[PDB]
Design an enzyme around this catalytic site. Structure first.
Site, PDB file in Angstrom:
ATOM      1  N   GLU A  98       0.825  -1.232   0.000  1.00 55.00           N
ATOM      2  CA  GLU A  98       0.000   0.000   0.000  1.00 55.00           C
ATOM      3  C   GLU A  98       0.854   1.275   0.000  1.00 55.00           C
ATOM      4  O   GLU A  98       0.672   2.147  -0.852  1.00 55.00           O
ATOM      5  CB  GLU A  98      -0.914   0.009   1.224  1.00 55.00           C
ATOM      6  CG  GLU A  98      -1.621   1.321   1.537  1.00 55.00           C
ATOM      7  CD  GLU A  98      -2.162   1.362   2.962  1.00 55.00           C
ATOM      8  OE1 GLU A  98      -1.357   1.547   3.912  1.00 55.00           O
ATOM      9  OE2 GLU A  98      -3.394   1.200   3.121  1.00 55.00           O
ATOM     10  N   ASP A 141      -9.712   1.334   6.553  1.00 56.43           N
ATOM     11  CA  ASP A 141      -9.805   1.127   5.102  1.00 56.43           C
ATOM     12  C   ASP A 141     -10.883   2.001   4.477  1.00 56.43           C
ATOM     13  O   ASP A 141     -10.662   2.658   3.453  1.00 56.43           O
ATOM     14  CB  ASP A 141     -10.160  -0.297   4.745  1.00 56.43           C
ATOM     15  CG  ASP A 141      -8.974  -1.238   4.785  1.00 56.43           C
ATOM     16  OD1 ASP A 141      -8.031  -1.012   5.560  1.00 56.43           O
ATOM     17  OD2 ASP A 141      -9.023  -2.222   4.023  1.00 56.43           O
TER      18      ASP A 141
HETATM   19  O1  LIG Z   1      -3.633 -15.312   3.519  1.00 59.71           O
HETATM   20  C1  LIG Z   1      -4.465 -14.164   3.411  1.00 59.71           C
HETATM   21  C2  LIG Z   1      -3.643 -13.040   3.974  1.00 59.71           C
HETATM   22  O2  LIG Z   1      -2.448 -12.829   3.215  1.00 59.71           O
HETATM   23  C3  LIG Z   1      -4.500 -11.782   4.009  1.00 59.71           C
HETATM   24  O3  LIG Z   1      -3.754 -10.729   4.569  1.00 59.71           O
HETATM   25  C4  LIG Z   1      -4.375  -9.447   4.346  1.00 59.71           C
HETATM   26  C5  LIG Z   1      -3.685  -8.733   3.204  1.00 59.71           C
HETATM   27  O4  LIG Z   1      -4.113  -7.368   3.091  1.00 59.71           O
HETATM   28  C6  LIG Z   1      -3.963  -6.589   4.255  1.00 59.71           C
HETATM   29  O5  LIG Z   1      -4.431  -5.297   3.933  1.00 59.71           O
HETATM   30  C7  LIG Z   1      -3.491  -4.276   3.586  1.00 59.71           C
HETATM   31  C8  LIG Z   1      -3.097  -3.504   4.824  1.00 59.71           C
HETATM   32  O6  LIG Z   1      -4.230  -2.847   5.414  1.00 59.71           O
HETATM   33  C9  LIG Z   1      -5.035  -1.971   4.593  1.00 59.71           C
HETATM   34  O7  LIG Z   1      -5.107  -0.624   5.110  1.00 59.71           O
HETATM   35  C10 LIG Z   1      -4.483  -1.910   3.177  1.00 59.71           C
HETATM   36  O8  LIG Z   1      -5.432  -1.234   2.335  1.00 59.71           O
HETATM   37  C11 LIG Z   1      -4.112  -3.290   2.587  1.00 59.71           C
HETATM   38  O9  LIG Z   1      -3.152  -3.042   1.562  1.00 59.71           O
HETATM   39  C12 LIG Z   1      -4.819  -7.223   5.341  1.00 59.71           C
HETATM   40  O10 LIG Z   1      -4.805  -6.455   6.527  1.00 59.71           O
HETATM   41  C13 LIG Z   1      -4.335  -8.638   5.630  1.00 59.71           C
HETATM   42  O11 LIG Z   1      -5.216  -9.278   6.552  1.00 59.71           O
HETATM   43  O12 LIG Z   1      -5.617 -11.971   4.882  1.00 59.71           O
HETATM   44  C14 LIG Z   1      -6.459 -13.018   4.422  1.00 59.71           C
HETATM   45  C15 LIG Z   1      -5.739 -14.355   4.235  1.00 59.71           C
HETATM   46  O13 LIG Z   1      -6.632 -15.291   3.586  1.00 59.71           O
END
Ligand SMILES: O[C@@H]1[C@@H](O)[C@H](O[C@@H]2CO[C@@H](O[C@@H]3CO[C@@H](O)[C@H](O)[C@H]3O)[C@H](O)[C@H]2O)OC[C@H]1O
Length: 393
Positions: free
Chosen positions: A69, A277
């Site tokens: 991000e 988010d």
């Molecule tokens: O295995 C899967 C995990 O890898 C997955 O992880 C999520 C990936 O995205 C993350 O979100 C980012 C950080 O927070 C927000 O503000 C941003 O917009 C995103 O780029 C999220 O937090 C993780 O949980 O989770 C699900 C599994 O199936």
């Protein structure tokens, strides 16, 4: 829309600010966040160099990591501000450390979403909003600076990544977390971005990841065979926001289902509420309206959100249920910044007050400065009429 005319609204100018002062404000924000004190102000860190030249990363101070991000936001901010040196260093770092190049790895083609500052992955899987911003920032780089070669062939890199986002097949393979299985990053029938390509939670989305403003760019410059798919994704996201945003408040949840309803993640059931988010949803639809003029619902949605936040004057929280009950926290710079971007589509003149509120802020310091700061700088660029569609050949 602004793309058709080439005239982007300078909302700060519309509320009386001089060009010189607007330039000062943006330049201050950039200097603090990219070159300010290393322990209190900066989010950008130079990290040596390799065969491609300098390396740098955007530091998620809030959570002590480097996120896709942040890296992708850093690329967007720097291309918008014509800061090619910084852009190239960030991109080099992402392509060097985050990008998964192994075809037997389930994240093949994608960027590990959470990394340590030394380049070691916390989670090999991607966060698809990262990819969305990387692709778009790369196309904008190609438009502004022209294409280099290898990793600096911005347009070729964008084309490849975006093609893979659509066409990636299912792969089961080892990761830093054990064996995993992942698919594409957009659902082929829904034409919606996924929350994760991890097969265990793949059939969900996140309203803040819906970027119709960017999908319109892809619909014009992607590999020809995918352009109709991206045009469809743009129509679908506009409809998505109409379904996902609460009818009274226009608050969206952090996470969602393809049908527009909130999704409670098993590990984060409070994802059904408006939290970190979802602050960004209004920016996404408002930008889309300002650029393209196609989301007929965007102006009313922006007016509703601003009307809601007007009711919170002097008791603003930063976490809400979708019907508008406060769930904790005080005002944050990030939420102030995002609410100002609603002025890209709002019609009710209360928007003046939100833009003025952003104008009054200082760059952030301390432990939570990353999420606040990247949103602040993007909002300043939007509100200044300096965040444009740079469409390549
Ligand atoms: O295995 C899967 C995990 O890898 C997955 O992880 C999520 C990936 O995205 C993350 O979100 C980012 C950080 O927070 C927000 O503000 C941003 O917009 C995103 O780029 C999220 O937090 C993780 O949980 O989770 C699900 C599994 O199936």
């Amino acid at each position: 829309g602004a793309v058709a005319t080439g005239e982007y609204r300078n909302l700060f100018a519309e509320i009386g600010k001089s060009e010189i002062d607007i330039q000062r404000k943006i330049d201050e924000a950039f200097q603090h966040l990219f070159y300010g004190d290393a322990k209190d102000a900066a989010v950008y860190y130079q990290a040596g160099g390799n065969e491609n030249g300098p390396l740098a990363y955007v530091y998620d101070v809030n959570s002590n990591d480097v996120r896709s991000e942040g890296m992708s936001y850093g690329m967007m901010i720097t291309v918008q501000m014509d800061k090619k040196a910084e852009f190239d260093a960030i991109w080099n770092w992402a392509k060097t450390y985050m990008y998964q190049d192994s075809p037997t790895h389930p994240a093949f083609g994608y960027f590990a979403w959470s990394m340590r500052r030394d380049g070691v992955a916390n989670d090999d899987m991607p966060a698809p909003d990262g990819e969305e911003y990387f692709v778009t920032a790369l196309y904008f780089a190609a438009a502004r600076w022209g294409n280099g070669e290898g990793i600096f062939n911005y347009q070729q890199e964008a084309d490849t990544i975006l093609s893979r986002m659509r066409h990636r097949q299912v792969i089961t393979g080892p990761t830093n977390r054990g064996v995993m299985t992942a698919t594409n990053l957009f659902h082929p029938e829904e034409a919606q971005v996924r929350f994760t390509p991890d097969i265990n939670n793949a059939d969900h989305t996140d309203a803040s990841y819906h970027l119709p403003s960017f999908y319109e760019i892809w619909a014009r410059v992607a590999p020809q065979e995918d352009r109709a798919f991206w045009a469809k994704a743009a129509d679908v996201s506009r409809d998505y926001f109409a379904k996902a945003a609460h009818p009274v408040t226009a608050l969206t949840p952090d996470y969602g289902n393809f049908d527009g309803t909130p999704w409670a993640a098993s590990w984060r059931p409070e994802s059904v509420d408006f939290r970190y988010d979802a602050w960004r949803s209004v920016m996404n639809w408002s930008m889309d309206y300002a650029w393209w003029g196609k989301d007929s619902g965007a102006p009313a949605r922006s007016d509703k959100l601003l009307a809601f936040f007007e009711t919170q004057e002097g008791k603003m929280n930063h976490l809400y249920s979708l019907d508008g009950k406060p769930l904790g926290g005080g005002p944050t710079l990030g939420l102030i910044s995002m609410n100002a971007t609603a002025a890209m589509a709002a019609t009710d003149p209360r928007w003046h007050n939100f833009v003025e509120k952003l104008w009054q802020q200082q760059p952030p310091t301390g432990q939570y400065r990353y999420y606040d700061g990247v949103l602040y700088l993007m909002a300043l660029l939007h509100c200044a009429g300096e965040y444009k569609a740079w469409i390549p050949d």
